[PDB]
Amino acid sequence: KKVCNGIGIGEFKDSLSINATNIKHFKNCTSISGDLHILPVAFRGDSFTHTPPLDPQELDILKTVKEITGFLLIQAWPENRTDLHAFENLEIIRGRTKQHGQFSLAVVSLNITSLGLRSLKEISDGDVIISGNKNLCYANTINWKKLFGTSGQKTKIISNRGENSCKATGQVCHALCSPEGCWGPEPRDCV
Amino acid sequence: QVQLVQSGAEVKKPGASVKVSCKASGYTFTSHWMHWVRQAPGQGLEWIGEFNPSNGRTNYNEKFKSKATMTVDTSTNTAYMELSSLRSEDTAVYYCASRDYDYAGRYFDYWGQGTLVTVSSASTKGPSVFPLAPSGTAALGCLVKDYFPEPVTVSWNSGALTSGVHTFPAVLQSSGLYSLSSVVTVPSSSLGTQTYICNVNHKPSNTKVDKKVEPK
Amino acid sequence: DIQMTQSPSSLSASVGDRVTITCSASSSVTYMYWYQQKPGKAPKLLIYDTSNLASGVPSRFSGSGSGTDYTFTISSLQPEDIATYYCQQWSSHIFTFGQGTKVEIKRTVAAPSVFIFPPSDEQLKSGTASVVCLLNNFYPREAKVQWKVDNALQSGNSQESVTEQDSKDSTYSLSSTLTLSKADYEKHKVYACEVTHQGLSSPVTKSFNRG
Numbered sequence A: 001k002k003v004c005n006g007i008g009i010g011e012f013k014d015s016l017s018i019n020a021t022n023i024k025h026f027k028n029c030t031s032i033s034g035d036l037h038i039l040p041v042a043f044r045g046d047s048f049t050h051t052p053p054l055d056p057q058e059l060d061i062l063k064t065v066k067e068i069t070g071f072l073l074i075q076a077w078p079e080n081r082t083d084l085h086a087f088e089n090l091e092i093i094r095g096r097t098k099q100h101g102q103f104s105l106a107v108v109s110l111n112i113t114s115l116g117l118r119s120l121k122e123i124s125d126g127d128v129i130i131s132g133n134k135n136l137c138y139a140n141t142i143n144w145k146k147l148f149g150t151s152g153q154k155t156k157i158i159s160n161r162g163e164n165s166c167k168a169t170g171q172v173c174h175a176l177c178s179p180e181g182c183w184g185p186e187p188r189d190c191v
Numbered sequence B: 001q002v003q004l005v006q007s008g009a010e011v012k013k014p015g016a017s018v019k020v021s022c023k024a025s026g027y028t029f030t031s032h033w034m035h036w037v038r039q040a041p042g043q044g045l046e047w048i049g050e051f052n053p054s055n056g057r058t059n060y061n062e063k064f065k066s067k068a069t070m071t072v073d074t075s076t077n078t079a080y081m082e083l084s085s086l087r088s089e090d091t092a093v094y095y096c097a098s099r100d101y102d103y104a105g106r107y108f109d110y111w112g113q114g115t116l117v118t119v120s121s122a123s124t125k126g127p128s129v130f131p132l133a134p135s136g137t138a139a140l141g142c143l144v145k146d147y148f149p150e151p152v153t154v155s156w157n158s159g160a161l162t163s164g165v166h167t168f169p170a171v172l173q174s175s176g177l178y179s180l181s182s183v184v185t186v187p188s189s190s191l192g193t194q195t196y197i198c199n200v201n202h203k204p205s206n207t208k209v210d211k212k213v214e215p216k
Numbered sequence C: 001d002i003q004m005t006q007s008p009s010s011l012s013a014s015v016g017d018r019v020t021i022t023c024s025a026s027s028s029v030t031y032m033y034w035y036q037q038k039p040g041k042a043p044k045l046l047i048y049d050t051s052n053l054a055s056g057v058p059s060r061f062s063g064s065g066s067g068t069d070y071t072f073t074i075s076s077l078q079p080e081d082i083a084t085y086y087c088q089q090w091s092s093h094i095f096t097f098g099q100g101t102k103v104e105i106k107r108t109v110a111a112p113s114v115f116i117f118p119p120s121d122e123q124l125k126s127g128t129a130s131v132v133c134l135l136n137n138f139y140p141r142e143a144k145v146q147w148k149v150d151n152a153l154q155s156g157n158s159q160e161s162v163t164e165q166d167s168k169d170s171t172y173s174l175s176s177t178l179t180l181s182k183a184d185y186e187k188h189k190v191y192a193c194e195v196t197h198q199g200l201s202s203p204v205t206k207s208f209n210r211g
Helices: A020-026 A040-044 A058-064 A163-168 C121-126 C182-186
Strands: A003-005 A031-033 A036-038 A072-074 A103-108 A127-131 B003-006 B010-012 B019-025 B034-039 B045-051 B058-060 B068-073 B078-083 B092-101 B107-111 B115-119 B128-132 B137-147 B153-156 B165-167 B178-187 B197-202 B207-212 C004-007 C010-014 C019-025 C031-037 C043-048 C061-064 C069-074 C083-091 C094-097 C101-106 C113-117 C128-138 C144-149 C158-162 C172-181 C191-196 C204-208
Touching: A020 A058, B003 B092, B003 B107, B019 B092, B019 B115, B034 B068, B045 B068, B045 C083, B045 C094, B058 B068, B078 B092, B107 C043, B128 B207, B128 C121, B137 B197, B137 C113, B137 C128, B153 B178, B178 C128, B178 C172, C004 C083, C010 C019, C019 C083, C019 C101, C043 C061, C069 C083, C113 C191, C113 C204, C121 C128, C121 C182, C128 C144, C128 C182, C128 C191, C144 C158, C144 C172, C172 C182, C172 C191
Parallel strands: A003 A031, A036 A072, A072 A103, A103 A127, B010 B115, C010 C101
Antiparallel strands: B003 B019, B019 B078, B034 B045, B034 B092, B045 B058, B068 B078, B092 B107, B092 B115, B128 B137, B137 B178, B153 B197, B165 B178, B197 B207, C004 C019, C019 C069, C031 C043, C031 C083, C061 C069, C083 C094, C083 C101, C113 C128, C128 C172, C144 C191, C158 C172, C191 C204
């Protein structure tokens, strides 16, 4: 067990995203005091900030992170990686700080087809934004409420691979599932 | 469709408890947060807390953490609210209300009929019902005298006549017992051809009465 | 942790008139609601988030304001709008209600239909007499019921209650009841009450004769 400064907090201030330069400083981490930001710039790399592009293999380092005290913001993510694998073991977001003061989970404009946050059992505060993920399915099938701390919590889960094409291309809850929800196709995704 | 049918009223002596039930009909239960609001008589609304009937999480308002405790029985779509160390100040209408935000983003909002809880050092007595016989227009009615505690129900024929009834505010008598009157205005023509019945229920005493009101 | 000041306490205005109820806040507030409670019924959400008219609610209702300042408006007050209105705020996991604002309709003067009820024989068998006098559908709410048994007045033996404003015709109703012991009731005849009201030119007296 170990709690690490996130992006923004501590020396990781002044730094827009998780990236090559800092990523390694998350090795064997448990809780994250702060926010997680994965921006376009993490994969493009930046000349201005003296920063090499990220080997999207190094996202596998996030695998041990159970708690995020602030918020999660994934705007970019490996075009061929189809899932949010790295965050499989992520169990809880506090939302103690929030994107625009509102959003504790932000999954925008990604190539994901499943979300795959299989261990996520609690968003303590803040709302969920799931936008523009052209091929994402399965998000609807879950009961977000079961993940929530107040009435005041919302889901702006708009503008993805319309639920129709899902059932059409057969992208719905695998049969084994106790109809409460899906994070993806296979049995290891029943909410 | 959406309905919240809350338990009957009851009277309690200070110190006692009370578990007030709320049977939620008409929607997918494990989907919406259940709230409890208190209303002291002649007075405004105070929020006691919310319950997420799906995961069991709970949010109370400062004052009520000690007094109230919120529970649910998903098996039978019913939410409870139990009050501790009962005080003369807990006398109020307890409402439950399913309040929430839709997946659609829109708000969700439905309320019970409220459950009256009277805290007092006095025993339940059912009422006696006495006609008020017919006197253009004719007025008749019912007198529901001598009972405790509030509330009493008065409906006419059987919730079939409602135009021009006035069921009045009860009055605490010098005795220590409430008394109330319900009157209807009708065509004097009907007196002949029509039967007029009042339906009085005082649930706390399980007294349920129907008195025919005739011109004598 | 957030503390609401709603205002005013009461408000009388005419049909068609503009009704505005402010509701102020101590610290800042994320979400603002507006509820309507008609007499004897439960609360009803009219507006949520600040201005979002709940489903079904007519046009005349609205709610505005930003920061710590919220206004609620009924642009064109209809008779059925009699109630007490409450704002609530939701901030950092806890709800908080305002004090209420009783909105009441002002109308033209109306005269009370007087009625007079003798005790029931069932009640008399028992040991007590109840003489009920009903003033029916009148505005304003000011009015006096004076009990007169055999031409003499009565005090401390008579109680009354007044209903809320009728949601359809904006009028009240009053039930003054006179109580004597079955004994005291035999002793006299001719039981009456004088009714002083605004809309009444000369105090209407209704009565009967037994006892």
